[PDB]
Every structure is written in structure tokens, then in C-alpha cells.
Amino acid sequence: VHLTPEEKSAVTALWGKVNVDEVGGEALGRLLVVYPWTQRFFESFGDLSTPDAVMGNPKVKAHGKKVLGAFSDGLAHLDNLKGTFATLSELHCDKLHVDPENFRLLGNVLVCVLAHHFGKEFTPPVQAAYQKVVAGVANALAHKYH
Amino acid sequence: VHLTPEEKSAVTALWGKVNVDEVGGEALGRLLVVYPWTQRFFESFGDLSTPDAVMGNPKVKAHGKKVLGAFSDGLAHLDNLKGTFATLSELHCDKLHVDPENFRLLGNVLVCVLAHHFGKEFTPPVQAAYQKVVAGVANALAHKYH
Amino acid sequence: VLSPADKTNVKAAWGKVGAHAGEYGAEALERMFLSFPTTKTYFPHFDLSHGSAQVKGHGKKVADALTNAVAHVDDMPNALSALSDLHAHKLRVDPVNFKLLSHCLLVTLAAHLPAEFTPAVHASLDKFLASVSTVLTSKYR
Amino acid sequence: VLSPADKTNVKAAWGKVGAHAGEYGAEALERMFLSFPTTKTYFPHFDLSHGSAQVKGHGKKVADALTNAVAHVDDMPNALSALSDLHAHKLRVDPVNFKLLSHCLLVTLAAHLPAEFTPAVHASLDKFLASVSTVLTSKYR
Ligand code: HEM
Numbered sequence: 001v002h003l004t005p006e007e008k009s010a011v012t013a014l015w016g017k018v019n020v021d022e023v024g025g026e027a028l029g030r031l032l033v034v035y036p037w038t039q040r041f042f043e044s045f046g047d048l049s050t051p052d053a054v055m056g057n058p059k060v061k062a063h064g065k066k067v068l069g070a071f072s073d074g075l076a077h078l079d080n081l082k083g084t085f086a087t088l089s090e091l092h093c094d095k096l097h098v099d100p101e102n103f104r105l106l107g108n109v110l111v112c113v114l115a116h117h118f119g120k121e122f123t124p125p126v127q128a129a130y131q132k133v134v135a136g137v138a139n140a141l142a143h144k145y146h
Numbered sequence: 147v148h149l150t151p152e153e154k155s156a157v158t159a160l161w162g163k164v165n166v167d168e169v170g171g172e173a174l175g176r177l178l179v180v181y182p183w184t185q186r187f188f189e190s191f192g193d194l195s196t197p198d199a200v201m202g203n204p205k206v207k208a209h210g211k212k213v214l215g216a217f218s219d220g221l222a223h224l225d226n227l228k229g230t231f232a233t234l235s236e237l238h239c240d241k242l243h244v245d246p247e248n249f250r251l252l253g254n255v256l257v258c259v260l261a262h263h264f265g266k267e268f269t270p271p272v273q274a275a276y277q278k279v280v281a282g283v284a285n286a287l288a289h290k291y292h
Numbered sequence: 293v294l295s296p297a298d299k300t301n302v303k304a305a306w307g308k309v310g311a312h313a314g315e316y317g318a319e320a321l322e323r324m325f326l327s328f329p330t331t332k333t334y335f336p337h338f339d340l341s342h343g344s345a346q347v348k349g350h351g352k353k354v355a356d357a358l359t360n361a362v363a364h365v366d367d368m369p370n371a372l373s374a375l376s377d378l379h380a381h382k383l384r385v386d387p388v389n390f391k392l393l394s395h396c397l398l399v400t401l402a403a404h405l406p407a408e409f410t411p412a413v414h415a416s417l418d419k420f421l422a423s424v425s426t427v428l429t430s431k432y433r
Numbered sequence: 434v435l436s437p438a439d440k441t442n443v444k445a446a447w448g449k450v451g452a453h454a455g456e457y458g459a460e461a462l463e464r465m466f467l468s469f470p471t472t473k474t475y476f477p478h479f480d481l482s483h484g485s486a487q488v489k490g491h492g493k494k495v496a497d498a499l500t501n502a503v504a505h506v507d508d509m510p511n512a513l514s515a516l517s518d519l520h521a522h523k524l525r526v527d528p529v530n531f532k533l534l535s536h537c538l539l540v541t542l543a544a545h546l547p548a549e550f551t552p553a554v555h556a557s558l559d560k561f562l563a564s565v566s567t568v569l570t571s572k573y574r
């Protein structure tokens with residue numbers, strides 16, 4: 001992901017303020033409400049019939065927390081996204097069968113949550129560095145498909 | 147691109163049967179007729195009033211031979227599409243102002259012209275190698291945009 | 293919108309397809325699977341091999357839906373309603389994939405119809421496939 | 434289609450935006466050009482610096498068209514007819530560009546609406562912008 005030196009600094013500063021457990025449940029929760037066809041992989045999760053049922057479902061929340069804890073690890077290895085996400089790539093391909101379009105959509109839902117959560121501090125120039133991050137993370141997660 | 151020893155050989159043997167001037171004239175006019183908004187850059191080319199006139203327009207064919215030769219030229223540097231297209235990438239941004247999506251549509255209309263021109267010899271596996279090539283050339287042409 | 297000339301070029305081109313519809317469908321599915329490997333995530337337990345009997349079966353179901361859409365070009369939404377409900381509520385395939393399948397069907401038709409795949413015809417077909425794809429995802433959300 | 438709840442959620446949000454519409458239209462444009470630079474190929478002889486008077490003037494125009502669309506949510510095609518002809522016959526902007534402006538208009542509103550940018554309201558805005566982008570390109574071919 002070529003991020004400029006000025007972009008990297010900004011991404012890491014913002015990231016130090018993120019409670020990963022709470023942002024992860026919110027981002028996966030918004031993925032399931034805004035793009036409802038994404039609920040196809042969660043048939044054992046119970047109630048996902050309304051925005052409030054998706055948002056408050058203990059299973060959605062627990063899953064969001066594990067998904068974003070792994071994503072947080074990528075931000076710590078920005079020059080090696082493909083190797084840090086290789087195992088997870090082989091897992092979403094061979095065992096869970098997830099179309100990688102799914103990662104690009106969550107990535108973009110993430111950008112909106114960060115903007116919401118942080119307000120004015122999520123400036124045009126910070127957005128562009130996050131957009132570089134989200135695309136690199138999604139390219140890395142799709143890398144071992146075949 | 148990403149091509150295997152076997153993809154490289156399928157592509158090069160097919161190209162060897164192409165008349166650069168005719169396929170280039172044929173693919174650019176198809177671009178101009180399937181996605182008409184692409185006409186925005188060539189309003190000085192005269193008559194673009196019906197599929198028959200666009201296809202027959204001598205400037206349409208001139209321009210087409212011109213773009214298909216630089217593409218033809220690029221098939222000799224499959225392991226480095228990027229650097230072979232940098233100077234044209236800079237020129238398509240800075241002097242010409244052309245959105246890179248136009249390169250991908252052209253790439254994909256060309257695959258249709260190859261299937262038409264060749265028939266059953268354009269097999270599922272040969273299409274596959276050509277898909278890596280056109281997406282490889284569009285991506286190298288979009289590379290120097292800023 | 294599809295126009296009278298579109299609807300004319302489509303019927304004439306799909307009409308030439310005829311009884312090969314099934315065969316064309318499976319090739320389009322194979323062209324897809326090979327050129328864009330991410331589409332395979334939707335057929336996890338299919339036997340995806342060259343000549344698979346399962347792929348042949350599914351291409352025939354696909355070609356047949358397109359036949360019904362051609363025969364009801366004037367009202368595809370009513371025509372494809374069990375089909376959009378099934379894609380929106382069960383299958384749930386992502387919208388980026390229908391562009392990939394549409395391209396592969398045009399490539400298959402270009403390779404089988406030398407004389408019928410003229411410039412204006414190719415253009416009407418691209419428009420009808422996009423129209424079929426919008427109807428299939430129209431109940432997604 | 435936009436549900437009764439979609440319509441209700443968009444008007445509530447856009448009303449909260451109120452008099453800052455033009456500024457948000459200018460901010461979304463700047464978010465657009467720094468994030469996805471190929472979009473600048475459409476404004477080659479424009480001054481795009483931060484605070485430029487050409488970006489400010491275009492933000493306003495953009496925002497007025499959306500307010501208009503918000504007032505005629507049940508009649509969009511008619512409402513936006515002159516702009517759909519302008520984009521289809523003169524400007525001719527590639528359709529993939531409209532997802533980029535729409536995404537940057539949701540980030541802009543989320544950055545300014547702490548309480549109103551709820552998950553049900555986010556959903557609604559995303560469907561609405563997509564429908565205004567489908568009207569704008571509806572005459573391209
Ligand atoms: C930021 C991108 C993503 C990351 C880092 C990530 C990470 C993970 C991780 C770490 C697991 C745990 C697996 C195990 O040991 O079995 C997992 C499972 C899973 N992920 Fe992803 N994920 C991402 C995006 C997505 C998306 C967008 C979807 C689908 C909408 C998805 C669907 C699933 C499913 C269905 C499982 C298995 C869940 C279960 O055990 O019930 N993931 N993911």
C-alpha cells in the first residue's frame with residue numbers, strides 16, 4: 001500500500017484512539033444492515049431481521065470483535081499485508097467460501113464508521129490515506145483465492 | 147502480469163495471426179458504439195451518426211491502428227507492462243485527460259472482437275490468459291495518474 | 293431502456309441460439325469460472341471440472357431463464373419474479389458477479405455467431421443482459 | 434425501491450443538513466478528488482485547490498440538485514430530466530464515477546451528523562444516492 005510518510009503517521013495516530021471491540025461490532029453490524037445479502041453466511045445467528053436486531057445481536061457483536069482484532073493486526077504491518085493476511089485468505093477461500101467483494105464493501109463501511117465516530121478529525125487527507133489502507137487490506141485478503 | 151509459462155504461449159501464438167490495423171480499427175469502433183459516451187474525446191472525427199458510419203470513418207480506423215500498435219508493442223514485455231506503458235500513462239493523464247475506466251472497457255471490447263474474429267479457437271483457457279493481459283495493460287495505463 | 297431495435301436485435305440473436313442454449317450456458321459458466329475464480333465461491337460443493345455434469349445442468353437452467361426473459365422482453369420484472377425473490381432471499385449472490393457472467397455470455401455468443409454479432413447487435417445484447425441483471429437484484433434491499 | 438422508511442429517513446437527514454448543503458457538496462468533491470484522483474480528469478481546466486471558488490460554485494450546484502431530488506423522491510426521473518440529458522449528451526462522465534461521489538457524500542454527512550447518522554439512516558442514504566445516480570445515467574445509451 002503506497003502510503004506517503006505523511007499518510008502513515010496519520011493512520012497510526014487515528015488508530016491509537018480505536019476501541020477495536022466496539023468498532024468491530026459496529027462495522028460488521030452496519031455491513032449486515034446496509035448490504036443485507038451479506039447475512040447469507042450467518043444463518044445460525046438468530047435475529048437479523050431489523051437494524052436494531054442486527055445491531056444488538058450478541059453474535060454479531062462477538063463476530064465483529066474477532067474480525068476487527070485481526071484487521072488491527074494488519075495496521076501494524078503495512079509493508080507486509082499479503083503475508084500477515086495469508087492464513088486468513090486461505091481460510092475465507094477454502095473453508096468459508098466468501099466472495100472478496102465482501103472485504104471491499106466492509107472496508108468502505110469501515111471508512112463511514114470512522115468518519116461518524118470521529119467527526120471533523122476525519123479530514124479529506126486522512127480519508128484518502130484510510131482509503132489506501134482499506135483497499136490494501138482487501139487486496140491482501142483476496143490474494144490466495146484460486 | 148501473473149501469466150504462467152503456458153498463458154504466455156497461448157497469447158503469443160494467437161497474436162501472431164492478428165492484423166493489427168484491422169483489429170485495432172474494429173475494436174475502437176466497437177468501443178464507440180457499445181458505450182457511446184466514449185465518443186466525448188473524438189468530436190473532430192467527423193460522422194459518428196450510426197454504427198455503420200462510426201465503423202467506416204477513416205479517422206476512426208486511423209486512431210484504432212495507432213492505439214492497437216502501442217498495445218501490440220506491449221505484448222513483447224509481458225513481465226513488465228507497467229514500465230512499458232509509463233510514458234503513455236503520463237501522456238493520457240497530463241495532456242489528454244482520459245479516465246482510465248476507458249482502458250478497461252476497451253480491453254473488454256477487444257476480448258469480444260478476438261472471440262468474434264477467431265471463433266472456437268478463442269477457448270475458455272485462452273480467454274482467461276487474455277483477461278489477465280487486458281486487465282494488466284489497463285492497470286499499467288492507469289498507473290501514473292495523480 | 294431497451295428500445296424497439298434492441299428488442300428486435302435480441303430476439304433475432306437469441307432465436308439463432310435455439311436448442312444450443314443449454315450448451316452455450318455451460319460454456320459461459322466455464323468461461324466465468326476460469327477467467328474470474330472468485331465466482332466459484334458460490335458453487336462450493338459443485339464438481340467444477342471441464343465437462344462436469346453439474347455445470348451442464350446449471351447452464352441449461354440459466355439459458356432457460358434467459359429464454360423466458362427474451363419471450364417477455366416487454367415485462368421482465370413479472371417474468372423473472374420467482375427468480376428475483378430466490379436470488380434476493382436465499383442465494384444472495386453479490387451484484388458485481390452478474391457483470392462477469394454477462395460478459396462471458398457475450399464472448400460465448402461472439403464465438404458462435406460470426407454473421408449475427410455485428411456492432412449494433414453486440415450493443416443491444418450488452419444492454420439486455422444488464423437489464424436482466426438489474427431485475428434479478430432488484431429486491432436485494 | 435425506496436421504502437416508506439427510506440423516504441422518511443432521507444428527508445430527516447437532509448433537513449438536518451439544511452443550510453450547510455452547498456458546503457457539504459463542496460467538501461464531498463474535495464474528498465472525491467484527493468481519494469480517487471482519476472475523477473479529476475473531468476475537471477481539467479479547473480482550479481482544484483482547497484477553498485477554490487470553482488469547487489465552491491460546483492458544490493452548491495450539486496447540492497441544489499439533491500435537495501430537488503429529496504423534494505421529489507417519488508418522482509425522480511422527471512425531477513432530474515434536464516441533468517440526465519446534460520450528463521448523457523455533453524459531459525458523458527463514465528458511470529463508475531457516480532459510486533465514488535456517492536460514497537464521498539455518505540462520509541461527508543457521517544462526519545457532520547453524530548446523532549442522525551444511525552445504521553437504519555446510513556442504509557437509506559446509500560439506497561437513495563444509488564437511485565439518483567441510476568436516473569442521471571439513464572439516457573447514456
Ligand atoms: C477485514 C476483513 C476480515 C477479516 C480480517 C476477517 C477475519 C476473520 C477471522 C479471524 C475469522 C475466524 C475463523 C476461524 O478460526 O474459524 C473469520 C471467520 C469468518 N469470517 Fe471473516 N474477516 C473479514 C471479513 C469478512 C466478511 C466481510 C465476511 C462476510 C460477510 C466474513 C465472514 C466470515 C465468516 C462466515 C466466518 C466464520 C464464522 C463462524 O465461525 O461462525 N469475514 N473472519
Ligand code: HEM
Nearest residue numbers: 184187212213214216217234242244248249252253284287
Ligand atoms: C488501452 C489501450 C490504449 C493505448 C495503448 C493507447 C495509445 C495511444 C497512443 C500511442 C497515442 C498517440 C500518442 C502520441 O504520440 O501523441 C494515443 C493518443 C490518444 N489516445 Fe490513447 N490508447 C489507448 C486507449 C485509449 C482510449 C480507450 C481512449 C479514449 C476512449 C484514448 C484516447 C486517446 C486520444 C484522445 C488520443 C489523442 C488523439 C489525437 O491527437 O487525435 N486512448 N493513445
Ligand code: HEM
Nearest residue numbers: 331334335350353354357358383385389390393424425428
Ligand atoms: C443472467 C444472470 C443469471 C441468471 C439468468 C440466473 C439464473 C438462475 C436459475 C434459473 C437458477 C435456478 C433456481 C432453482 O433451482 O429453482 C439459479 C440458481 C443459482 N444461481 Fe443464479 N442466475 C444468474 C446469475 C447468477 C450469478 C452471477 C451467480 C454467481 C456467480 C449465480 C449463482 C447461482 C447459484 C449458486 C444458484 C444455485 C445453484 C445450485 O447450487 O444448484 N447466479 N440462477
Ligand code: HEM
Nearest residue numbers: 472475476491494495498499516524526530531534565566
Ligand atoms: C450525485 C451525482 C451528481 C449530481 C447530482 C450532479 C449534478 C451536476 C450539476 C447540478 C451540474 C451543473 C450543471 C450547470 O452547469 O448548470 C453538473 C455538471 C458537471 N458534472 Fe455532474 N453531477 C453528479 C455526478 C457527477 C460525476 C460523478 C462527475 C464526474 C466525476 C460529474 C461531472 C460533472 C462535470 C464535469 C460537470 C461540468 C462542470 C462545470 O463546468 O461547472 N458529475 N453535475
